Design a protein around this ligand. Structure first.
Ligand code: VXQ
Ligand code: CA
Length: 223
């Protein structure tokens, strides 16, 4: 996250870290057994780390649970990033508490102008490279379809939205991938892509979660 703030420990209780020897992506806990992330975060050998603040220090609220199964969306295209969503099942159910909690799925698509919270352990510099240990946060609005399209000609599908600031300075960044965009207590986006971080006229692009709720529910019901 560039241009964000320190969230505070365990203040974003649905935020997980995906670890394969090191943090490599965010995700969102959506029930005791399942996490939502980006398809471009897929790999084998994932351990889900819940209850994290400092990802380099055991602070006392963590739960570490290995994935039993990954399900990339049927229609994910890794060249266009259309349908950039996957589900990860945990080998055991997480203990839910005030610091480890699921985030609700949307029942309707959010509108441009809605305020959201984006979080993660990604790079905090737009030029340069510095990875934080503790979780960073950013409040950012959803941008209109038209302005998203204008920023990225011929790249924004109906499964994507932009959020952030056209003036730049405040955005998600590499290592935030797969993490949440939460708006009014609902998971509306997944950190997906963009062009650099926090550049003028290049806001973040996010997977539009409301389009995937019935796939998510049916997948959970049979897996
Ligand atoms: N600035 C949005 C954005 C830019 C780059 C990036 C990500 C997000 C996740 C992977 O790398
Ligand atoms: Ca920790």
């Amino acid at each position: 996250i560039v241009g964000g703030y320190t969230c505070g420990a365990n203040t974003v209780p649905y935020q997980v870290s995906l670890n394969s020897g090191y943090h490599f992506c965010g995700g969102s806990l959506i029930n005791s057994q399942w996490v939502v992330s980006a398809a471009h975060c897929y790999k084998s050998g994932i351990q889900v780390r819940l209850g994290e603040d400092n990802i380099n220090v055991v602070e006392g609220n963590e739960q570490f649970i290995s994935a039993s199964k990954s399900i990339v969306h049927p229609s994910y295209n890794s060249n266009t990033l259309n349908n950039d969503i996957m589900l990860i099942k945990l080998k055991s159910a997480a203990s839910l508490n005030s610091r480890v909690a699921s985030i609700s799925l949307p029942t309707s698509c959010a509108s441009a102008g809605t305020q959201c919270l984006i979080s993660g352990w990604g790079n905090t510099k737009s030029s340069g490279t510095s990875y934080p240990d503790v979780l960073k946060c950013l409040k950012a609005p959803i941008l209109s379809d038209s302005s998203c399209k204008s920023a990225y000609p011929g790249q924004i599908t109906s499964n994507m939205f932009c959020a952030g600031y056209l003036e730049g300075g405040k955005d998600s960044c590499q290592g935030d991938s797969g993490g949440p965009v939460v708006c009014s207590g609902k998971l509306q986006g997944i950190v997906s892509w963009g062009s650099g971080c926090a550049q003028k006229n290049k806001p973040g692009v996010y997977t539009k979660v409301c389009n995937y709720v019935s796939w998510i529910k049916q997948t959970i019901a049979s897996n």
